[PDB]
Amino acid sequence: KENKKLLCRKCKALACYTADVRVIEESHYTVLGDAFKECFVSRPHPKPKQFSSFEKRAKIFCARQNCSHDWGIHVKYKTFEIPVIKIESFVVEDIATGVQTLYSKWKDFHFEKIPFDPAEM
Amino acid sequence: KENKKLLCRKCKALACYTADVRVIEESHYTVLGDAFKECFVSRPHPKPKQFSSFEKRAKIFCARQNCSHDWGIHVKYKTFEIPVIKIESFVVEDIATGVQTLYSKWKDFHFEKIPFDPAEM
RNA sequence: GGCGCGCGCGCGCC
RNA sequence: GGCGCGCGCGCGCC
Ligand SMILES: [Zn+2]
Ligand SMILES: [Zn+2]
């Protein structure tokens, strides 16, 4: 499907394109590349936890000046440390139309969901 | 689906039975008979209104003096002056067992919902 | 995160 | 009464 842009629900800054998105265990979403790294800052999770395949360690936020909108978490997965985002904190913008959409749950946003991959990393 | 007793949620007093209840226009619950009239007291309605075919004429409360728990309102439905109750002010007691259930909305409470019938007065 | 839920206050309509 | 919604707090498992 059409590649799309995820912008902070709050400031509207560009976070990533679904192109760089990956799915884990069909329900957890993360973003590839250092580029996405410069886009958020993480911070010690007040109530870390271990569930399924992760150790929820940090809480992440939009890395821009006066927004710091909670974008989700940062976790240890296998031997990787990675961000796991929640579609609710972003706005999906269609590239060829500008149309924007607010999703609350990932199941509702139907785009090409490529499973997370070790090889790539 | 059996006959249950309705009890004032706050003081536990007997208000009425489910066999006496009747549903007006699928959303409002009144009570037939004199017994139920010996159970509540009416008082001026703080801010009368007028929704659909009803007109708020008063607030009704549990009769037991030391209780006075709000049970709902009293309205004019067509040519009738009748009490309209909200299950949330009551405790539904199963007659055989004593088992009591707290509901906040009438839709969640499943029993034989006999419709208001003018013939019955 | 994902899933589900509880609570507090605010608003509108019939 | 009944229904729809907004904002914010918290809980559980996995
Ligand atoms: Zn932002
Ligand atoms: Zn009472």
PDB file of C-alpha atoms (C1' of nucleotides) and ligand atoms in Angstrom:
ATOM      1  CA  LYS A   1       0.000   0.000   0.000  1.00  0.00           C
ATOM      2  CA  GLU A   2       0.963   3.639  -0.202  1.00  0.00           C
ATOM      3  CA  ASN A   3       3.848   4.606   1.988  1.00  0.00           C
ATOM      4  CA  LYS A   4       2.771   7.123   4.588  1.00  0.00           C
ATOM      5  CA  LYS A   5       4.100   9.609   7.055  1.00  0.00           C
ATOM      6  CA  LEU A   6       3.696   9.403  10.778  1.00  0.00           C
ATOM      7  CA  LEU A   7       3.755  12.832  12.405  1.00  0.00           C
ATOM      8  CA  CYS A   8       3.552  13.598  16.116  1.00  0.00           C
ATOM      9  CA  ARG A   9      -0.066  13.855  16.977  1.00  0.00           C
ATOM     10  CA  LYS A  10       1.047  16.962  18.912  1.00  0.00           C
ATOM     11  CA  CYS A  11       3.612  19.127  17.056  1.00  0.00           C
ATOM     12  CA  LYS A  12       3.272  17.515  13.628  1.00  0.00           C
ATOM     13  CA  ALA A  13       6.978  16.898  13.162  1.00  0.00           C
ATOM     14  CA  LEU A  14       7.980  14.075  10.872  1.00  0.00           C
ATOM     15  CA  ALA A  15       8.887  10.884  12.775  1.00  0.00           C
ATOM     16  CA  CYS A  16       9.142   8.233  10.055  1.00  0.00           C
ATOM     17  CA  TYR A  17       7.440   6.674   7.009  1.00  0.00           C
ATOM     18  CA  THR A  18       5.737   3.330   7.321  1.00  0.00           C
ATOM     19  CA  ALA A  19       8.473   2.262   4.947  1.00  0.00           C
ATOM     20  CA  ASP A  20      10.855   2.162   7.904  1.00  0.00           C
ATOM     21  CA  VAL A  21       8.314   0.466  10.163  1.00  0.00           C
ATOM     22  CA  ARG A  22       8.543  -3.142  11.388  1.00  0.00           C
ATOM     23  CA  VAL A  23       6.160  -5.393  13.315  1.00  0.00           C
ATOM     24  CA  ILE A  24       6.985  -7.764  16.148  1.00  0.00           C
ATOM     25  CA  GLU A  25       4.865 -10.747  17.004  1.00  0.00           C
ATOM     26  CA  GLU A  26       2.074  -9.158  14.895  1.00  0.00           C
ATOM     27  CA  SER A  27       1.261  -6.484  17.436  1.00  0.00           C
ATOM     28  CA  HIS A  28       4.321  -4.492  18.341  1.00  0.00           C
ATOM     29  CA  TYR A  29       5.665  -1.829  16.084  1.00  0.00           C
ATOM     30  CA  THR A  30       9.150  -0.403  15.852  1.00  0.00           C
ATOM     31  CA  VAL A  31      11.118   1.901  13.512  1.00  0.00           C
ATOM     32  CA  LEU A  32      14.414   1.186  11.652  1.00  0.00           C
ATOM     33  CA  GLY A  33      17.440   3.464  11.284  1.00  0.00           C
ATOM     34  CA  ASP A  34      19.461   6.045  13.217  1.00  0.00           C
ATOM     35  CA  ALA A  35      17.272   8.697  11.579  1.00  0.00           C
ATOM     36  CA  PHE A  36      14.351   7.706  13.777  1.00  0.00           C
ATOM     37  CA  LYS A  37      16.715   7.777  16.758  1.00  0.00           C
ATOM     38  CA  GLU A  38      17.391  11.508  16.415  1.00  0.00           C
ATOM     39  CA  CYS A  39      13.601  11.976  16.455  1.00  0.00           C
ATOM     40  CA  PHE A  40      12.882  10.896  20.032  1.00  0.00           C
ATOM     41  CA  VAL A  41      14.426  10.768  23.471  1.00  0.00           C
ATOM     42  CA  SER A  42      13.814   8.001  25.948  1.00  0.00           C
ATOM     43  CA  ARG A  43      13.687   8.236  29.713  1.00  0.00           C
ATOM     44  CA  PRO A  44      13.766   5.627  32.562  1.00  0.00           C
ATOM     45  CA  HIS A  45      10.423   3.894  32.838  1.00  0.00           C
ATOM     46  CA  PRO A  46       8.681   4.505  36.230  1.00  0.00           C
ATOM     47  CA  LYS A  47       7.375   0.983  36.210  1.00  0.00           C
ATOM     48  CA  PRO A  48       9.504  -1.228  33.999  1.00  0.00           C
ATOM     49  CA  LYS A  49       8.078  -4.727  33.318  1.00  0.00           C
ATOM     50  CA  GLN A  50       8.769  -7.936  31.511  1.00  0.00           C
ATOM     51  CA  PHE A  51       6.047  -9.252  29.284  1.00  0.00           C
ATOM     52  CA  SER A  52       6.020 -11.597  26.313  1.00  0.00           C
ATOM     53  CA  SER A  53       9.408 -11.144  24.670  1.00  0.00           C
ATOM     54  CA  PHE A  54      10.355  -7.727  26.093  1.00  0.00           C
ATOM     55  CA  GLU A  55      11.740  -5.985  29.123  1.00  0.00           C
ATOM     56  CA  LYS A  56       9.929  -2.603  29.002  1.00  0.00           C
ATOM     57  CA  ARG A  57      12.765  -0.298  30.137  1.00  0.00           C
ATOM     58  CA  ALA A  58      12.101   3.185  28.900  1.00  0.00           C
ATOM     59  CA  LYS A  59       9.389   5.588  27.972  1.00  0.00           C
ATOM     60  CA  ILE A  60       9.970   7.533  24.710  1.00  0.00           C
ATOM     61  CA  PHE A  61       8.961  11.025  23.616  1.00  0.00           C
ATOM     62  CA  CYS A  62       8.950  13.333  20.592  1.00  0.00           C
ATOM     63  CA  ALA A  63      12.436  14.904  20.662  1.00  0.00           C
ATOM     64  CA  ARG A  64      11.283  18.419  19.761  1.00  0.00           C
ATOM     65  CA  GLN A  65      11.587  21.586  21.799  1.00  0.00           C
ATOM     66  CA  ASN A  66       8.272  22.275  23.423  1.00  0.00           C
ATOM     67  CA  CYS A  67       6.288  19.078  22.614  1.00  0.00           C
ATOM     68  CA  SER A  68       7.831  16.049  24.369  1.00  0.00           C
ATOM     69  CA  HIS A  69       4.721  14.069  23.523  1.00  0.00           C
ATOM     70  CA  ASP A  70       4.825  10.489  24.773  1.00  0.00           C
ATOM     71  CA  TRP A  71       5.458   8.332  21.701  1.00  0.00           C
ATOM     72  CA  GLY A  72       5.599   5.020  23.511  1.00  0.00           C
ATOM     73  CA  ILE A  73       8.401   2.901  24.949  1.00  0.00           C
ATOM     74  CA  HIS A  74      11.917   1.558  24.516  1.00  0.00           C
ATOM     75  CA  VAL A  75      12.615  -2.082  25.370  1.00  0.00           C
ATOM     76  CA  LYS A  76      15.147  -4.878  25.309  1.00  0.00           C
ATOM     77  CA  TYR A  77      14.138  -7.456  22.675  1.00  0.00           C
ATOM     78  CA  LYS A  78      16.356 -10.517  22.381  1.00  0.00           C
ATOM     79  CA  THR A  79      19.763  -8.768  22.335  1.00  0.00           C
ATOM     80  CA  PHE A  80      18.435  -5.510  20.778  1.00  0.00           C
ATOM     81  CA  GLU A  81      17.278  -2.340  22.468  1.00  0.00           C
ATOM     82  CA  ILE A  82      14.518  -0.734  20.377  1.00  0.00           C
ATOM     83  CA  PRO A  83      11.596   1.699  20.301  1.00  0.00           C
ATOM     84  CA  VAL A  84       8.016   0.307  20.236  1.00  0.00           C
ATOM     85  CA  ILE A  85       5.544   2.991  19.244  1.00  0.00           C
ATOM     86  CA  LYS A  86       1.798   3.396  19.584  1.00  0.00           C
ATOM     87  CA  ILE A  87      -0.052   4.644  16.528  1.00  0.00           C
ATOM     88  CA  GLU A  88      -2.290   6.736  18.775  1.00  0.00           C
ATOM     89  CA  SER A  89       0.489   9.234  19.421  1.00  0.00           C
ATOM     90  CA  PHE A  90       0.977  10.076  15.721  1.00  0.00           C
ATOM     91  CA  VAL A  91      -1.059  11.318  12.735  1.00  0.00           C
ATOM     92  CA  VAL A  92      -0.900   9.372   9.462  1.00  0.00           C
ATOM     93  CA  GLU A  93      -0.543  11.587   6.457  1.00  0.00           C
ATOM     94  CA  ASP A  94      -1.112  10.219   2.991  1.00  0.00           C
ATOM     95  CA  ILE A  95       1.595  11.482   0.669  1.00  0.00           C
ATOM     96  CA  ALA A  96      -0.266  11.933  -2.588  1.00  0.00           C
ATOM     97  CA  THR A  97      -3.257  13.634  -1.010  1.00  0.00           C
ATOM     98  CA  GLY A  98      -2.168  15.163   2.279  1.00  0.00           C
ATOM     99  CA  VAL A  99      -5.181  13.478   3.875  1.00  0.00           C
ATOM    100  CA  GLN A 100      -4.500  12.731   7.535  1.00  0.00           C
ATOM    101  CA  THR A 101      -5.889  10.106   9.811  1.00  0.00           C
ATOM    102  CA  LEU A 102      -6.049   9.445  13.528  1.00  0.00           C
ATOM    103  CA  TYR A 103      -5.769   5.771  14.541  1.00  0.00           C
ATOM    104  CA  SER A 104      -6.112   4.577  18.101  1.00  0.00           C
ATOM    105  CA  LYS A 105      -5.224   0.954  17.508  1.00  0.00           C
ATOM    106  CA  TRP A 106      -2.709  -0.505  15.054  1.00  0.00           C
ATOM    107  CA  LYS A 107      -5.158  -3.264  13.839  1.00  0.00           C
ATOM    108  CA  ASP A 108      -7.202  -0.417  12.204  1.00  0.00           C
ATOM    109  CA  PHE A 109      -4.381   1.137  10.192  1.00  0.00           C
ATOM    110  CA  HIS A 110      -3.965  -1.232   7.234  1.00  0.00           C
ATOM    111  CA  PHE A 111      -0.651  -0.598   5.579  1.00  0.00           C
ATOM    112  CA  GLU A 112       2.119  -2.987   4.601  1.00  0.00           C
ATOM    113  CA  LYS A 113       3.235  -4.529   7.860  1.00  0.00           C
ATOM    114  CA  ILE A 114       6.681  -6.079   7.380  1.00  0.00           C
ATOM    115  CA  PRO A 115       7.628  -8.435  10.265  1.00  0.00           C
ATOM    116  CA  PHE A 116      10.660  -7.334  12.320  1.00  0.00           C
ATOM    117  CA  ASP A 117      13.851  -8.883  11.074  1.00  0.00           C
ATOM    118  CA  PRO A 118      17.146  -9.953  12.678  1.00  0.00           C
ATOM    119  CA  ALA A 119      19.093 -10.078   9.373  1.00  0.00           C
ATOM    120  CA  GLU A 120      18.340  -6.394   8.680  1.00  0.00           C
ATOM    121  CA  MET A 121      19.990  -5.584  12.022  1.00  0.00           C
TER     122      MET A 121
ATOM    123  CA  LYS B   1     -35.242 -14.300  34.248  1.00  0.00           C
ATOM    124  CA  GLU B   2     -36.931 -14.937  37.564  1.00  0.00           C
ATOM    125  CA  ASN B   3     -38.641 -12.385  39.825  1.00  0.00           C
ATOM    126  CA  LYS B   4     -36.091 -10.340  41.766  1.00  0.00           C
ATOM    127  CA  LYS B   5     -36.496  -7.786  44.516  1.00  0.00           C
ATOM    128  CA  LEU B   6     -35.208  -4.234  44.092  1.00  0.00           C
ATOM    129  CA  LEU B   7     -33.643  -2.771  47.172  1.00  0.00           C
ATOM    130  CA  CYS B   8     -32.504   0.812  47.946  1.00  0.00           C
ATOM    131  CA  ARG B   9     -28.800   0.528  47.274  1.00  0.00           C
ATOM    132  CA  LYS B  10     -27.931   2.615  50.310  1.00  0.00           C
ATOM    133  CA  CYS B  11     -30.183   1.357  53.153  1.00  0.00           C
ATOM    134  CA  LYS B  12     -31.188  -2.079  51.758  1.00  0.00           C
ATOM    135  CA  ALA B  13     -34.896  -1.473  52.189  1.00  0.00           C
ATOM    136  CA  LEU B  14     -37.376  -3.235  49.943  1.00  0.00           C
ATOM    137  CA  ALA B  15     -38.564  -0.957  47.172  1.00  0.00           C
ATOM    138  CA  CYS B  16     -40.319  -3.273  44.796  1.00  0.00           C
ATOM    139  CA  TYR B  17     -40.277  -6.467  42.670  1.00  0.00           C
ATOM    140  CA  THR B  18     -39.272  -6.915  39.036  1.00  0.00           C
ATOM    141  CA  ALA B  19     -42.732  -8.202  38.194  1.00  0.00           C
ATOM    142  CA  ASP B  20     -44.067  -4.695  38.936  1.00  0.00           C
ATOM    143  CA  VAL B  21     -41.609  -2.830  36.763  1.00  0.00           C
ATOM    144  CA  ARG B  22     -42.603  -1.621  33.316  1.00  0.00           C
ATOM    145  CA  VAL B  23     -40.625  -0.064  30.533  1.00  0.00           C
ATOM    146  CA  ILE B  24     -41.711   3.194  28.895  1.00  0.00           C
ATOM    147  CA  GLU B  25     -40.586   3.782  25.299  1.00  0.00           C
ATOM    148  CA  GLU B  26     -37.755   1.276  25.726  1.00  0.00           C
ATOM    149  CA  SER B  27     -35.641   3.340  28.110  1.00  0.00           C
ATOM    150  CA  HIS B  28     -37.468   4.323  31.216  1.00  0.00           C
ATOM    151  CA  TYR B  29     -38.504   2.269  34.155  1.00  0.00           C
ATOM    152  CA  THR B  30     -41.469   2.973  36.296  1.00  0.00           C
ATOM    153  CA  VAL B  31     -43.189   0.782  38.967  1.00  0.00           C
ATOM    154  CA  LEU B  32     -46.844  -0.253  39.250  1.00  0.00           C
ATOM    155  CA  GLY B  33     -48.861  -0.550  42.481  1.00  0.00           C
ATOM    156  CA  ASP B  34     -49.393   1.185  45.838  1.00  0.00           C
ATOM    157  CA  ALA B  35     -46.758  -0.756  47.737  1.00  0.00           C
ATOM    158  CA  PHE B  36     -44.056   1.129  45.800  1.00  0.00           C
ATOM    159  CA  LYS B  37     -45.739   4.405  46.647  1.00  0.00           C
ATOM    160  CA  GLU B  38     -45.420   3.618  50.304  1.00  0.00           C
ATOM    161  CA  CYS B  39     -41.660   3.472  49.603  1.00  0.00           C
ATOM    162  CA  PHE B  40     -40.555   6.809  48.224  1.00  0.00           C
ATOM    163  CA  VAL B  41     -41.145  10.467  48.929  1.00  0.00           C
ATOM    164  CA  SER B  42     -41.275  13.147  46.233  1.00  0.00           C
ATOM    165  CA  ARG B  43     -39.674  16.570  46.423  1.00  0.00           C
ATOM    166  CA  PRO B  44     -39.599  19.606  44.062  1.00  0.00           C
ATOM    167  CA  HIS B  45     -37.328  18.948  41.119  1.00  0.00           C
ATOM    168  CA  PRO B  46     -34.329  21.334  41.316  1.00  0.00           C
ATOM    169  CA  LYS B  47     -34.226  21.949  37.561  1.00  0.00           C
ATOM    170  CA  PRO B  48     -37.276  20.689  35.660  1.00  0.00           C
ATOM    171  CA  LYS B  49     -36.956  19.923  31.953  1.00  0.00           C
ATOM    172  CA  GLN B  50     -38.903  18.169  29.233  1.00  0.00           C
ATOM    173  CA  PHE B  51     -37.441  15.244  27.270  1.00  0.00           C
ATOM    174  CA  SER B  52     -39.571  13.596  24.553  1.00  0.00           C
ATOM    175  CA  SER B  53     -43.092  12.818  25.847  1.00  0.00           C
ATOM    176  CA  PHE B  54     -42.087  13.309  29.519  1.00  0.00           C
ATOM    177  CA  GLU B  55     -41.903  16.318  31.780  1.00  0.00           C
ATOM    178  CA  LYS B  56     -39.777  16.344  34.923  1.00  0.00           C
ATOM    179  CA  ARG B  57     -42.101  17.164  37.810  1.00  0.00           C
ATOM    180  CA  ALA B  58     -39.997  16.008  40.803  1.00  0.00           C
ATOM    181  CA  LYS B  59     -37.180  14.110  42.434  1.00  0.00           C
ATOM    182  CA  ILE B  60     -38.112  10.950  44.314  1.00  0.00           C
ATOM    183  CA  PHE B  61     -36.163   9.464  47.210  1.00  0.00           C
ATOM    184  CA  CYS B  62     -36.075   6.450  49.463  1.00  0.00           C
ATOM    185  CA  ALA B  63     -38.772   6.820  52.202  1.00  0.00           C
ATOM    186  CA  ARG B  64     -36.733   5.502  55.142  1.00  0.00           C
ATOM    187  CA  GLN B  65     -35.937   8.803  56.865  1.00  0.00           C
ATOM    188  CA  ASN B  66     -32.337   8.035  57.784  1.00  0.00           C
ATOM    189  CA  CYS B  67     -31.703   7.134  54.150  1.00  0.00           C
ATOM    190  CA  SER B  68     -33.380   9.503  51.708  1.00  0.00           C
ATOM    191  CA  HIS B  69     -31.405   7.966  48.883  1.00  0.00           C
ATOM    192  CA  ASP B  70     -32.188   9.499  45.509  1.00  0.00           C
ATOM    193  CA  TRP B  71     -34.106   6.911  43.458  1.00  0.00           C
ATOM    194  CA  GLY B  72     -34.911   9.046  40.432  1.00  0.00           C
ATOM    195  CA  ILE B  73     -37.734  11.280  39.296  1.00  0.00           C
ATOM    196  CA  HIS B  74     -41.438  11.680  38.915  1.00  0.00           C
ATOM    197  CA  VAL B  75     -42.925  12.687  35.595  1.00  0.00           C
ATOM    198  CA  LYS B  76     -46.037  13.223  33.554  1.00  0.00           C
ATOM    199  CA  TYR B  77     -46.141  10.679  30.738  1.00  0.00           C
ATOM    200  CA  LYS B  78     -49.157  11.516  28.642  1.00  0.00           C
ATOM    201  CA  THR B  79     -52.072  11.395  31.091  1.00  0.00           C
ATOM    202  CA  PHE B  80     -50.047   9.664  33.787  1.00  0.00           C
ATOM    203  CA  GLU B  81     -47.984  10.881  36.721  1.00  0.00           C
ATOM    204  CA  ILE B  82     -45.500   8.142  37.383  1.00  0.00           C
ATOM    205  CA  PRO B  83     -42.138   7.471  38.964  1.00  0.00           C
ATOM    206  CA  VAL B  84     -39.176   6.839  36.688  1.00  0.00           C
ATOM    207  CA  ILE B  85     -36.284   4.993  38.406  1.00  0.00           C
ATOM    208  CA  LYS B  86     -32.599   4.380  37.703  1.00  0.00           C
ATOM    209  CA  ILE B  87     -31.318   0.902  38.601  1.00  0.00           C
ATOM    210  CA  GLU B  88     -28.049   2.428  39.835  1.00  0.00           C
ATOM    211  CA  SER B  89     -29.881   3.551  43.017  1.00  0.00           C
ATOM    212  CA  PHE B  90     -30.904   0.006  43.780  1.00  0.00           C
ATOM    213  CA  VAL B  91     -29.605  -3.441  44.532  1.00  0.00           C
ATOM    214  CA  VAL B  92     -31.241  -6.285  42.678  1.00  0.00           C
ATOM    215  CA  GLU B  93     -31.715  -9.222  45.084  1.00  0.00           C
ATOM    216  CA  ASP B  94     -32.368 -12.771  43.857  1.00  0.00           C
ATOM    217  CA  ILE B  95     -35.227 -13.997  45.993  1.00  0.00           C
ATOM    218  CA  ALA B  96     -34.091 -17.656  46.397  1.00  0.00           C
ATOM    219  CA  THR B  97     -30.454 -16.853  47.344  1.00  0.00           C
ATOM    220  CA  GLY B  98     -30.070 -13.356  48.821  1.00  0.00           C
ATOM    221  CA  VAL B  99     -27.402 -12.820  46.163  1.00  0.00           C
ATOM    222  CA  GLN B 100     -27.295  -9.093  45.282  1.00  0.00           C
ATOM    223  CA  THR B 101     -26.231  -7.379  42.053  1.00  0.00           C
ATOM    224  CA  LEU B 102     -25.233  -3.833  41.373  1.00  0.00           C
ATOM    225  CA  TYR B 103     -25.957  -2.457  37.947  1.00  0.00           C
ATOM    226  CA  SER B 104     -25.178   1.068  36.785  1.00  0.00           C
ATOM    227  CA  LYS B 105     -27.273   0.913  33.609  1.00  0.00           C
ATOM    228  CA  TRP B 106     -30.670  -0.714  32.851  1.00  0.00           C
ATOM    229  CA  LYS B 107     -29.425  -2.152  29.551  1.00  0.00           C
ATOM    230  CA  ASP B 108     -26.992  -4.423  31.566  1.00  0.00           C
ATOM    231  CA  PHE B 109     -29.809  -5.810  33.705  1.00  0.00           C
ATOM    232  CA  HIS B 110     -31.564  -8.640  31.949  1.00  0.00           C
ATOM    233  CA  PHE B 111     -35.009  -9.619  33.198  1.00  0.00           C
ATOM    234  CA  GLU B 112     -38.481  -9.730  31.620  1.00  0.00           C
ATOM    235  CA  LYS B 113     -38.996  -6.174  30.605  1.00  0.00           C
ATOM    236  CA  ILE B 114     -42.745  -5.881  30.341  1.00  0.00           C
ATOM    237  CA  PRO B 115     -43.667  -2.657  28.377  1.00  0.00           C
ATOM    238  CA  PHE B 116     -45.791   0.109  29.903  1.00  0.00           C
ATOM    239  CA  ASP B 117     -49.436  -0.545  28.982  1.00  0.00           C
ATOM    240  CA  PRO B 118     -52.087   2.176  29.565  1.00  0.00           C
ATOM    241  CA  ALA B 119     -54.775  -0.475  30.079  1.00  0.00           C
ATOM    242  CA  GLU B 120     -53.016  -1.381  33.326  1.00  0.00           C
ATOM    243  CA  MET B 121     -53.839   2.198  34.365  1.00  0.00           C
TER     244      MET B 121
ATOM    245  C1'   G C   1       3.751  -1.589  23.992  1.00  0.00           C
ATOM    246  C1'   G C   2      -0.747  -5.020  23.118  1.00  0.00           C
ATOM    247  C1'   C C   3      -5.526  -6.320  25.186  1.00  0.00           C
ATOM    248  C1'   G C   4      -9.297  -5.262  28.740  1.00  0.00           C
ATOM    249  C1'   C C   5     -10.968  -2.636  32.546  1.00  0.00           C
ATOM    250  C1'   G C   6     -12.195   0.854  36.821  1.00  0.00           C
ATOM    251  C1'   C C   7     -12.452   6.128  38.464  1.00  0.00           C
ATOM    252  C1'   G C   8     -12.734  11.560  38.742  1.00  0.00           C
ATOM    253  C1'   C C   9     -14.706  16.211  36.397  1.00  0.00           C
ATOM    254  C1'   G C  10     -16.521  18.648  31.975  1.00  0.00           C
ATOM    255  C1'   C C  11     -20.523  18.865  27.377  1.00  0.00           C
ATOM    256  C1'   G C  12     -24.481  18.057  24.293  1.00  0.00           C
ATOM    257  C1'   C C  13     -29.247  15.943  22.495  1.00  0.00           C
ATOM    258  C1'   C C  14     -34.229  13.178  23.066  1.00  0.00           C
TER     259        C C  14
ATOM    260  C1'   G D   1     -34.662   9.455  33.423  1.00  0.00           C
ATOM    261  C1'   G D   2     -32.033   7.730  28.929  1.00  0.00           C
ATOM    262  C1'   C D   3     -28.194   8.278  25.318  1.00  0.00           C
ATOM    263  C1'   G D   4     -23.738  10.306  22.740  1.00  0.00           C
ATOM    264  C1'   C D   5     -19.030  12.659  23.496  1.00  0.00           C
ATOM    265  C1'   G D   6     -14.450  15.513  25.511  1.00  0.00           C
ATOM    266  C1'   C D   7     -10.589  15.961  29.006  1.00  0.00           C
ATOM    267  C1'   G D   8      -7.576  13.776  32.864  1.00  0.00           C
ATOM    268  C1'   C D   9      -6.026   9.643  36.870  1.00  0.00           C
ATOM    269  C1'   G D  10      -5.278   4.646  37.815  1.00  0.00           C
ATOM    270  C1'   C D  11      -5.457  -1.102  37.604  1.00  0.00           C
ATOM    271  C1'   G D  12      -4.611  -6.284  35.624  1.00  0.00           C
ATOM    272  C1'   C D  13      -2.338 -10.217  32.659  1.00  0.00           C
ATOM    273  C1'   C D  14       0.604 -11.474  28.818  1.00  0.00           C
TER     274        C D  14
HETATM  275 ZN    ZN E   1       5.995  16.545  19.013  1.00  0.00          ZN
HETATM  276 ZN    ZN E   2     -32.971   3.682  51.521  1.00  0.00          ZN
END
